[PDB]
Scaffold this active site. Structure first.
Site, PDB file in Angstrom:
ATOM      1  N   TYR A  71       0.832  -1.206   0.000  1.00 40.63           N
ATOM      2  CA  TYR A  71       0.000   0.000   0.000  1.00 40.63           C
ATOM      3  C   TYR A  71       0.867   1.257   0.000  1.00 40.63           C
ATOM      4  CZ  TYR A  71      -2.644  -3.512   2.820  1.00 40.63           C
ATOM      5  OH  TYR A  71      -3.224  -4.665   3.313  1.00 40.63           O
ATOM      6  N   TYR A  75      -0.806   7.569   6.604  1.00 42.66           N
ATOM      7  CA  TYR A  75      -0.896   6.524   7.616  1.00 42.66           C
ATOM      8  C   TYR A  75      -0.567   7.103   8.987  1.00 42.66           C
ATOM      9  CZ  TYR A  75       0.718   2.438  10.267  1.00 42.66           C
ATOM     10  OH  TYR A  75       0.910   1.487  11.252  1.00 42.66           O
ATOM     11  N   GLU A  84      -5.490   2.775  14.438  1.00 43.53           N
ATOM     12  CA  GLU A  84      -4.554   2.863  13.322  1.00 43.53           C
ATOM     13  C   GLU A  84      -5.382   3.270  12.101  1.00 43.53           C
ATOM     14  OE1 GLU A  84      -3.007  -0.939  11.882  1.00 43.53           O
ATOM     15  OE2 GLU A  84      -1.043  -0.036  11.519  1.00 43.53           O
ATOM     16  N   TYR A  86      -5.701   4.775   7.803  1.00 43.76           N
ATOM     17  CA  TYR A  86      -5.113   4.811   6.474  1.00 43.76           C
ATOM     18  C   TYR A  86      -5.961   5.638   5.528  1.00 43.76           C
ATOM     19  CZ  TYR A  86      -2.572   0.358   7.388  1.00 43.76           C
ATOM     20  OH  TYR A  86      -1.771  -0.647   7.863  1.00 43.76           O
ATOM     21  N   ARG A 120      -8.094  -5.303  14.707  1.00 47.72           N
ATOM     22  CA  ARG A 120      -6.833  -6.000  14.956  1.00 47.72           C
ATOM     23  C   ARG A 120      -6.856  -6.523  16.387  1.00 47.72           C
ATOM     24  NH1 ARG A 120      -3.019  -7.655  11.797  1.00 47.72           N
ATOM     25  NH2 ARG A 120      -1.257  -6.362  12.504  1.00 47.72           N
ATOM     26  N   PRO A 124       0.893  -5.861  16.814  1.00 46.76           N
ATOM     27  CA  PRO A 124       1.807  -4.749  17.113  1.00 46.76           C
ATOM     28  C   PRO A 124       1.136  -3.382  16.972  1.00 46.76           C
ATOM     29  CG  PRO A 124       2.897  -6.378  15.735  1.00 46.76           C
ATOM     30  CD  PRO A 124       1.448  -6.773  15.795  1.00 46.76           C
ATOM     31  N   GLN A 134      -9.076  -0.344  13.084  1.00 43.33           N
ATOM     32  CA  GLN A 134      -8.427   0.407  12.016  1.00 43.33           C
ATOM     33  C   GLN A 134      -9.497   1.114  11.194  1.00 43.33           C
ATOM     34  OE1 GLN A 134      -6.859  -3.413  10.315  1.00 43.33           O
ATOM     35  NE2 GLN A 134      -4.905  -2.306  10.378  1.00 43.33           N
ATOM     36  N   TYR A 169       1.769   9.775  15.534  1.00 41.96           N
ATOM     37  CA  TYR A 169       2.435  10.135  14.278  1.00 41.96           C
ATOM     38  C   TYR A 169       1.515  10.050  13.055  1.00 41.96           C
ATOM     39  CZ  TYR A 169       3.612   5.194  13.070  1.00 41.96           C
ATOM     40  OH  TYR A 169       3.586   3.852  12.750  1.00 41.96           O
ATOM     41  N   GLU A 175       3.783   0.446   2.692  1.00 42.63           N
ATOM     42  CA  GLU A 175       3.613  -0.781   3.453  1.00 42.63           C
ATOM     43  C   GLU A 175       3.724  -1.946   2.481  1.00 42.63           C
ATOM     44  OE1 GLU A 175       0.371  -0.912   6.207  1.00 42.63           O
ATOM     45  OE2 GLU A 175       0.449  -3.071   6.468  1.00 42.63           O
TER      46      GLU A 175
HETATM   47  O1  LIG Z   1       9.491   0.126  19.400  1.00 46.33           O
HETATM   48  C1  LIG Z   1       8.062   0.029  19.243  1.00 46.33           C
HETATM   49  C2  LIG Z   1       7.777  -0.029  17.816  1.00 46.33           C
HETATM   50  O2  LIG Z   1       8.221  -1.264  17.306  1.00 46.33           O
HETATM   51  C3  LIG Z   1       6.300   0.106  17.546  1.00 46.33           C
HETATM   52  O3  LIG Z   1       6.084   0.249  16.147  1.00 46.33           O
HETATM   53  C4  LIG Z   1       4.759   0.125  15.651  1.00 46.33           C
HETATM   54  C5  LIG Z   1       4.353  -1.338  15.709  1.00 46.33           C
HETATM   55  O4  LIG Z   1       3.069  -1.519  15.069  1.00 46.33           O
HETATM   56  C6  LIG Z   1       3.081  -1.080  13.700  1.00 46.33           C
HETATM   57  O5  LIG Z   1       1.760  -1.298  13.199  1.00 46.33           O
HETATM   58  C7  LIG Z   1       1.474  -2.392  12.332  1.00 46.33           C
HETATM   59  C8  LIG Z   1       1.865  -1.934  10.938  1.00 46.33           C
HETATM   60  O6  LIG Z   1       1.350  -2.825   9.928  1.00 46.33           O
HETATM   61  C9  LIG Z   1      -0.084  -2.850   9.957  1.00 46.33           C
HETATM   62  O7  LIG Z   1      -0.532  -3.610   8.918  1.00 46.33           O
HETATM   63  C10 LIG Z   1      -0.544  -3.437  11.278  1.00 46.33           C
HETATM   64  O8  LIG Z   1      -1.962  -3.338  11.355  1.00 46.33           O
HETATM   65  C11 LIG Z   1       0.083  -2.829  12.462  1.00 46.33           C
HETATM   66  O9  LIG Z   1      -0.004  -3.800  13.537  1.00 46.33           O
HETATM   67  C12 LIG Z   1       3.429   0.392  13.629  1.00 46.33           C
HETATM   68  O10 LIG Z   1       3.515   0.748  12.261  1.00 46.33           O
HETATM   69  C13 LIG Z   1       4.695   0.663  14.300  1.00 46.33           C
HETATM   70  O11 LIG Z   1       4.878   2.091  14.352  1.00 46.33           O
HETATM   71  O12 LIG Z   1       5.811   1.325  18.134  1.00 46.33           O
HETATM   72  C14 LIG Z   1       5.986   1.285  19.569  1.00 46.33           C
HETATM   73  C15 LIG Z   1       7.456   1.162  19.914  1.00 46.33           C
HETATM   74  O13 LIG Z   1       7.588   0.994  21.317  1.00 46.33           O
END
Ligand SMILES: O[C@@H]1[C@@H](O)[C@H](O[C@@H]2CO[C@@H](O[C@@H]3CO[C@@H](O)[C@H](O)[C@H]3O)[C@H](O)[C@H]2O)OC[C@H]1O
Length: 188
Positions: A71, A75, A84, A86, A120, A124, A134, A169, A175
């Site tokens: 993508y 974001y 999150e 988009y 989600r 992460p 999202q 942010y 992506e």
């Molecule tokens: O150090 C930590 C970082 O690693 C953390 O980074 C974020 C982790 O989650 C990410 O989001 C995913 C991105 O891809 C998408 O498809 C998913 O839905 C998400 O899960 C995000 O982009 C990172 O910024 O941030 C916290 C720090 O402590």
């Protein structure tokens, strides 16, 4: 460079991956960044702002050549609640809204966008492993350069019950999900 965040040539950047390999993120001058990937894992990287705002007009220009699942989007995140989001300007072979609940349509910056919400679970996030919604606007007319008037999206989302918390942010992000490609994007 390894995954991380920080400031580079006046712009915030974020680069995240799942550790798999096959992706190189590069910070260029001013608002420029490049991503080159091949047999990657899952990653997200780009330049912008920390914090973003709900009225920012974001400009992007350059090249975006995915070969497979990827993508190109405005974001970002909010906290409290954790969301999150988009505004997807272009994508490769996979529409991220596939099977998603459609929440409306909005017209902005020369195209209709379809609006969606997804879930989600234990994934992460900017606050670590978490469960969160999202929000998506998916542009019908693909493009790799333009301006995004983010307020049009945030307002349409809010009208449809998709509200945000405090802005974290906000970047123009490339992506990729286990694919290949290249991108060279300048943000302003
Ligand atoms: O150090 C930590 C970082 O690693 C953390 O980074 C974020 C982790 O989650 C990410 O989001 C995913 C991105 O891809 C998408 O498809 C998913 O839905 C998400 O899960 C995000 O982009 C990172 O910024 O941030 C916290 C720090 O402590």
């Amino acid at each position: 460079i390894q995954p991380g965040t920080g400031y580079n040539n006046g712009y915030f950047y974020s680069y995240w991956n799942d550790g798999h390999g096959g992706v190189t993120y590069t910070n260029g001058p001013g608002g420029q960044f490049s991503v080159n990937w091949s047999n990657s894992g899952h990653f997200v990287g780009g330049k912008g702002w920390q914090p973003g705002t709900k009225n920012k007009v974001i400009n992007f220009s350059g090249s975006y050549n995915p070969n497979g699942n990827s993508y190109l989007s405005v974001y970002g995140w909010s906290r409290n609640p954790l969301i999150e989001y988009y505004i997807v300007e272009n994508f490769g072979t996979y529409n991220p809204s596939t099977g998603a609940t459609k929440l409306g349509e909005v017209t902005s910056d020369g195209s209709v966008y379809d609006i969606y919400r997804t879930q989600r679970v234990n994934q992460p996030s900017i606050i670590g492993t978490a469960t969160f919604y999202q929000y998506w606007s998916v542009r019908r007319n693909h493009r790799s350069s333009g301006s995004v008037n983010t307020a049009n999206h945030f307002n349409a989302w809010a009208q449809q019950g998709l509200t945000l918390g405090t802005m974290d942010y906000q970047i123009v992000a490339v992506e990729g999900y286990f694919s290949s490609g290249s991108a060279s994007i300048t943000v302003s």
